[PDB]
Structure formats: C-alpha cells, structure tokens
C-alpha cells in the first residue's frame, strides 16, 4: 500500500524510532505497512503494532470523552458545533479501529498458530471492538458488544489450555476482558469474579518464575488489584 515501496526491516526500524520520538501516528503507519508485507510478526513486532495503535486510539478516546462530556452538558443552545465535532472525532476513531480489525482479519489471526500469537491478536480484536462499543449507539451496538465478547472468549479459552496462569498475555487478556465486563457489558460481578480468580491463580504460580518473569506477572497483578479496589 502506502508503505508498499519500503523494506519490511526499514518499516520496523522506523516504527521503533517513531516510538522514541513519540510520533505514534507515524508508528502505526509504519507497522500497518509492515503487517501488509504479509509475513507473520515476531513477539517484539506484535508489541510495536499494539503500542502504536493503542496510543493513537487512546488519544482519540480521551478526546471523544472530553467532547461527549461537553455535549451532554449542553443538552443554552450552542448550535450544532459540539455534536458535529464529537461526530468527527468519533468517525476518525471508528476508522482507526476498523483499520486494526482489518489487519487482524487480513490475515494476522488466521496465520497465527502458536498460542501466544493467536491469543495476542484475539485480545487485540476484543479491545478494538470494545473501543467501537464505547461510542456505539445505533442498530449495531449489541452486535459490536458481542463481537468483542466472542474474541475475548476465544482468547480466554486458548490461554487457559495453553499458557500458565502467570503468563503476561494471559493476565493482560483477563484484565482487559474484566474491563469489558464492567464498563461495556454491564456485568460488574463477572468483572470482579474474573479479576479475583485471575489474581489468585497467578499468585499461586509466582513460585515457578524467575526474577524477570515475576516482575512482569506482579505488575499486571497490581493492575488487577487496582481495578478490584476501584470496583469494591
């Protein structure tokens, strides 16, 4: 495509430079170009792809929330501008989510056979449908929510069969799916139960880990605990 004339290795190198320069839109474009080369991604490359788009959509989500709050307060007649601009940001956000979902569907997920890669991509699929669900209101909102649920569920089923309970991808997946239950699916008890069981099963497997693996698993356990403290 747009990056079609640049070497895969140069796109990866430039994505790393873009992250150091905090140029996340560039980073996402370089990683989209890398995915479109058609080869599978390594662990490090999957993290570059996720970092790039998570930062781009994260900024859009924060702007959408600011605008949505102003719009709800307005509803003196300020005219159509707040709604129009919220709609503009919302369309942009939806476009980025559609782009990421399109990369996952063409063809990252179908080529991912190892449990670590397949879980990583299905967790991303759940996350980008979740971001679509945060702004959805029309006839497809139920279907968008169900698409997030289904992706997270398939990732959970693989992770519980193929990864230890301290694996950081398994932990991050459970963290994000618990956020889905609380914030999207109106299922706070499911969210709390998932976070608690995940935390406790990870705690019981920490004894198997090296110092560096322990650091990763306990970092995500603390995120689970932080949500549990907020929710209880």
């Amino acid at each position: 495509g747009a990056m079609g004339s640049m070497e895969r290795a140069s796109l990866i190198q430039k994505a790393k430079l873009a992250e150091q320069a905090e140029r996340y839109e560039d980073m996402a474009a370089f990683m989209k170009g890398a995915v479109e080369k058609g080869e599978e991604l390594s662990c490090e490359e999957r993290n570059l792809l996720s970092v790039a788009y998570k930062n781009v959509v994260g900024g859009q989500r924060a702007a959408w929330r600011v605008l949505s709050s102003i719009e709800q307060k307005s509803n003196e007649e300020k005219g159509p501008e707040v709604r129009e601009y919220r709609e503009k940001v919302e369309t942009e956000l939806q476009g980025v989510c559609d782009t990421v979902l399109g990369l996952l569907d063409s063809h990252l997920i179908k080529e991912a056979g190892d449990a670590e890669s397949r879980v990583f991509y299905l967790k991303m699929k759940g996350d980008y449908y979740r971001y679509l669900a945060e702004v959805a209101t029309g006839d497809d909102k139920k279907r968008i929510i169900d698409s997030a649920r289904s992706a997270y569920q398939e990732a959970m089923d693989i992770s519980k069969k193929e990864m230890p309970p301290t694996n950081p991808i398994r932990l991050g997946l459970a963290l994000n799916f618990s956020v889905f239950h609380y914030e999207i699916a109106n299922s706070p008890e499911e969210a709390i139960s998932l976070a608690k069981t995940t935390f406790d099963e990870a705690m019981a497997d920490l004894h198997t880990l090296s110092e560096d693996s322990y650091k990763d698993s306990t970092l995500i356990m603390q995120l689970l605990r932080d949500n549990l403290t907020l929710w209880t």
């Binding site: 970092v51 998570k54 956020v179 914030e183 932080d226 929710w231």
Partner: peptide
C-alpha cells in the same frame, strides 16, 4: 478502571 498499557511503564 485500567486496561493493559502498551509498555511496562
């Protein structure tokens, strides 16, 4: 509530 960050930081 917080979701997973892109990097450990």
């Amino acid at each position: 509530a917080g979701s997973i960050p892109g990097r450990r930081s």
